[PDB]
Ligand SMILES: [Zn+2]
Ligand SMILES: [Zn+2]
Ligand SMILES: [Zn+2]
Ligand SMILES: [Zn+2]
Ligand SMILES: [Zn+2]
Ligand SMILES: [Zn+2]
Ligand SMILES: [Zn+2]
Ligand SMILES: [Zn+2]
């Protein structure tokens with residue numbers, strides 16, 4: 001087979017709720033591991049209709065589906081080191097927004113982020129990496145410079161500031177995103193994941209998530 | 211002792227992925243490395259044994275389909291696993307800072323991005339916004355495929371995996387030097403949405419498949 | 421200054437060039453000495469890197485007249501976009517000129533890729549990939565001549581700048597900025613107006 | 622029209638021509654060569670430039686003028702602060718590999734707004750918006766590395782930025798780095814002085830003479 005991926009998507013409130021609920025089962029050590037059976041997997045072959053895009057860090061400890069106790073076909077996932085944006089990232093999120101009509105973008109940071117740490121070391125010490133790793137650090141550095149100017153001092157302040165700045169760039173660069181937000185068909189949420197206890201902590205959002 | 215780095219070779223890293231995918235295929239996943247206790251030990255740092263560079267598609271959830279847990283794979287995902295400078299820096303971060311022994315390029319069937327590039331080339335149907343930037347980067351795979359006489363969409367998906375492998379090697383001396391040194395391998399895989407098999411298509415560097 | 425006077429100066433400059441009577445203005449030792457103070461150009465030229473399409477020469481301008489961005493086949497990436505926005509927002513140039521030309525090796529290479537599957541390696545592929553949708557779009561509309569894709573590519577470049585840059589699109593809406601799309605002819609040296617958004621007189 | 626085929630010039634002769642060129646410019650005796658009606662008609666055949674200049678977009682740093690060249694002499698890539706993105710890299714590689722240019726000039730200059738803006742970001746946390754931030758982000762590492770090495774004066778950061786741009790091109794492009802090892806290409810770091818119009822050699826990889 002049936003095609004179930006046509007027709008309208010859900011709303012930002014229902015989409016956020018399901019992610020909230022899922023991270024709660026994960027936190028409590030009670031994951032249901034849903035939407036992953038052999039039969040569910042086989043029915044996904046004709047198309048996808050995820051209810052969210054997670055734009056997360058590539059960090060191996062921040063596996064988005066696991067941490068929000070989702071399965072297959074639930075979330076479109078874009079992941080780069082320190083969730084930095086280039087034109088392929090931006091096109092990836094726009095595909096989900098404009099073709100899959102996802103009602104929710106989650107920008108997902110976390111503590112002990114090596115991309116945020118590298119940008120701190122660059123600014124404090126002039127320690128810069130080489131090759132394309134420098135391109136990642138380049139894109140994080142402004143978050144740290146803007147935080148510094150606002151009197152931020154703690155790593156966790158910079159990590160949170162980086163999520164907010166990522167939200168801000170998505171908004172400024174993409175009329176696809178900002179026009180759907182204005183229209184009320186899309187919300188964007190800034191979240192930090194806590195490696196200690198596995199809580200996904202809402203910090204920021206544009207649009208109604210309930 | 212406390213060791214730094216994954217302390218594993220490409221053969222073993224690949225073996226664990228193959229075995230995890232068999233568990234998933236069989237509908238017998240372990241859901242390993244995601245208990246509250248194991249999770250708590252990860253706040254200390256990450257030692258993943260591979261970087262997965264996969265499609266953003268909600269049905270190709272890399273950790274689930276290889277039946278891995280937290281701390282196991284650094285994950286980079288864009289639509290059609292297209293590359294640009296943040297993508298490349300992210301993969302290079304895992305290769306050079308985390309010293310991962312394996313890069314897995316994960317394509318799959320029913321890829322929207324490959325489909326969009328085929329429509330671009332067949333009809334001159336092009337998306338707008340930054341989604342076009344994704345399609346632009348897939349289009350060469352289709353053109354080179356067409357030139358070699360491929361016609362089937364599964365063939366283009368497979369060709370695109372191969373072209374992505376080749377781009378990583380061409381643009382990143384960090385990657386190509388470690389492959390030459392024997393400390394790194396790269397594997398191209400197609401995931402079958404039907405049955406969940408991650409199918410081996412391509413590799414450079416010894417992964418124990420000889 | 422203003423978009424109308426900016427484009428007038430450029431068109432007249434190109435006429436001096438076409439006639440083989442260049443002034444070579446604004447390049448004296450003394451004028452140059454005064455530029456060390458600051459720059460206040462009247463236009464940004466986004467042109468091709470081609471050695472034969474030297475923008476200051478073909479518009480018969482001098483030093484401090486035009487901010488110049490040049491990539492193979494006037495393809496855009498973020499550094500390009502950022503450069504144009506610098507002239508637009510920091511220098512307040514009233515005019516953007518998208519400068520294409522005939523016998524463009526990038527449009528040609530994009531032609532060869534779409535017709536043959538002939539593609540370059542390295543970063544040249546990244547240039548061609550960016551020109552390819554111009555060729556695909558023009559082909560969908562029954563374009564067949566090489567000079568025609570060249571023009572279509574100038575139009576697409578104009579459209580991309582408008583769509584990607586609210587700094588540009590807002591100023592064009594407010595009337596302080598105009599974007600002009602032009603094709604340079606290698607043979608007679610004429611810079612030919614093909615496209616524009618905003619009032620250019 | 623004709624279309625000519627053949628080997629391009631060598632790194633020593635290409636640098637000599639520009640060196641001599643800028644001397645005419647400095648001296649206020651511009652010959653404005655390779656711009657005649659007839660010469661222009663000749664170039665319809667094909668371009669055969671002897672150099673790629675990768676320069677700043679700054680309207681005061683007009684490359685053909687300051688080096689007193691004409692049409693068909695130099696392939697020209699310009700971005701604000703001569704920052705590199707993949708279109709820039711692809712542009713330079715087209716010149717290097719297809720046009721076989723024996724010389725790449727990375728052209729910085731004094732009073733560079735891109736370098737200025739990067740200094741203001743690291744010192745004050747002053748960051749521009751939109752895509753201008755992408756330019757400043759790419760210069761910022763040259764300033765951080767400068768500061769670490771004890772540089773203070775603005776001119777020293779401008780020069781350190783030219784050096785970092787040369788190093789990125791060498792590191793990102795195997796097409797470039799192989800040709801420099803083969804001896805068929807050279808890369809030069811130059812700083813243009815707005816004051817006297819002088820283009821000053823700073824660093825170089827390959828033999829320029
Ligand atoms: Zn049904
Ligand atoms: Zn259907
Ligand atoms: Zn991180
Ligand atoms: Zn915010
Ligand atoms: Zn330790
Ligand atoms: Zn896909
Ligand atoms: Zn051209
Ligand atoms: Zn002849």
Ligand SMILES: [Zn+2]
Pocket residue numbers: 624625626
């Ligand atoms: Zn020929």
Ligand SMILES: [Zn+2]
Pocket residue numbers: 677678679701702703730732733734735
């Ligand atoms: Zn400058």
Ligand SMILES: [Zn+2]
Pocket residue numbers: 784785787810824825
């Ligand atoms: Zn140097």
